Amino acid sequence: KQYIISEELISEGKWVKLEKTTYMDPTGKTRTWESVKRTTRKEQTADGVAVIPVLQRTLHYECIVLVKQFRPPMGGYCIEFPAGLIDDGETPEAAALRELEEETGYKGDIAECSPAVCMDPGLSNCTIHIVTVTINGDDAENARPKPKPGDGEFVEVISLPKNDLLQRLDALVAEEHLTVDARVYSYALALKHAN
Amino acid sequence: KQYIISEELISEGKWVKLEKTTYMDPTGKTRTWESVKRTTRKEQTADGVAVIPVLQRTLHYECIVLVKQFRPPMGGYCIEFPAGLIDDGETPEAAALRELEEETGYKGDIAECSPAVCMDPGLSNCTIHIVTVTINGDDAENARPKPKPGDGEFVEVISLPKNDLLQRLDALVAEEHLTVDARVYSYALALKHAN
Ligand SMILES: Cc1cccc(-c2nnc(Cn3c(N(C)C)nc4c3c(=O)n(C)c(=O)n4C)o2)c1
Ligand SMILES: Cc1cccc(-c2nnc(Cn3c(N(C)C)nc4c3c(=O)n(C)c(=O)n4C)o2)c1
């Protein structure tokens, strides 16, 4: 009932561009929006993947494997699902598994993969697949995960119990410029509400 | 050990600006990032709020109150938690209850409120509080909720049972294409994952 009329390039970087979006509202009136888009999408179903890595161990509660990373847009460190762009010709599942191993060293198994879901629709067209990945933490390869030799990134790995995720997130994040990712927190919230 | 070095304005719009961010990695090397920022943040705890509205009625499943609206950056419709900017001097909780009532007509009670969390930390500094808000659907107030939408806003309200959220989201999307918000999906996903 609403439709895009035109989208005009305002400013383009290497990774991200800014667009003026002209669209029609249901009354037939023309309106505008400032839209942020990534420049790196080609034939992918979404810009990237977020990985929900479930560390499964027979002697432990399931943990969610999270990464702590400096994020320049945030001017501080962030606790996130392992995440990254889907490479050209790569599947969400493949990107998820690769990205998990690159960032954490864990070798996971696909559990499930979401449709493309939007990161911040009121602002950007950015989408990810949320790929749930199980990690056999008792398997010897996963005994001591190494974020797979060189990477170029500086990533601390954090494993938090699934049954206490939200509280463990709040605890971590009170100390300064360390922010929880919104999706991580949404996930944590539902774990808490569901019990 | 990592910190923002300089922030260079590339392009500033009314709602959103685009910056090239120079930061110091642990190696002592300077790197750049393209960062998106909202222009509308003031002296706030976060830019805005997302509301997780749990519609509660005796002898009924809890429902999650979601909103559907055309999102120009997505050039299509998205299913989201009610969300909007925190006004000046406003609390996250107050913004949440206000935003919930504006979009859905529901008058809710604060259940809990998150710290500021990142909408998309790899791209923007955008933060929200995720505010869980319970709605007594048996109260006369909420018998007949009336949205009070803003000039430009056209918001459809969709209430999905909490106990079957992920499926009902899928069901919605099968009926016709829309994008589910990532925070909504993360929430829905965790409801199934819980335990
Ligand atoms: C922090 C946060 C979290 C979730 C949602 C929001 C948000 N949703 N809408 C707005 C504000 N907004 C309005 N209005 C409220 C009219 N118009 C807008 C915008 C807008 O942001 N842009 C980028 C625009 O281009 N136009 C035209 O903010 C903000
Ligand atoms: C879709 C999605 C969802 C969640 C996280 C990401 C993401 N996180 N990092 C990247 C890729 N990236 C890299 N690298 C992987 C080096 N560098 C970057 C970027 C980058 O996006 N920008 C905006 C940049 O400015 N520089 C410098 O993508 C992508």
Residue numbers in the entry:
A (entry chain A), B (entry chain B): 14 to 208
Which of the paper's sentences describe this entry?
Two predominant substrates have been identified for NUDT5: 8-oxo-dGDP and adenosine 5′diphosphoribose (ADPR).
The 8-dimethylamino variant, 2 (TH1713, MG assay IC50 = 70 nM), had more than 8-fold greater potency over TH1167. Preliminary lead compounds TH1533 and TH1713 each resulted in a 5 °C shift in melting temperature (Tm) at 20 µM compound concentrations, indicating inhibitor binding. To confirm the binding modality of the NUDT5 inhibitors and help guide further inhibitor development, NUDT5 was crystallized in complex with TH1713, and the structure was solved at 2.2 Å resolution. Pi stacking interactions between the theophylline ring and the indole rings of Trp28 (chain A) and Trp46 (chain B) further strengthen inhibitor binding. The oxadiazole group demonstrates variable water coordination and the 3-methylbenzene group extends into a hydrophobic cavity where it rotates between two alternate orientations. Synthetic derivatives, TH1713 and TH1533, had more potent biochemical activity and could stabilize NUDT5 against thermal degradation in vitro; however, only TH1533 showed activity by CETSA in intact cells.
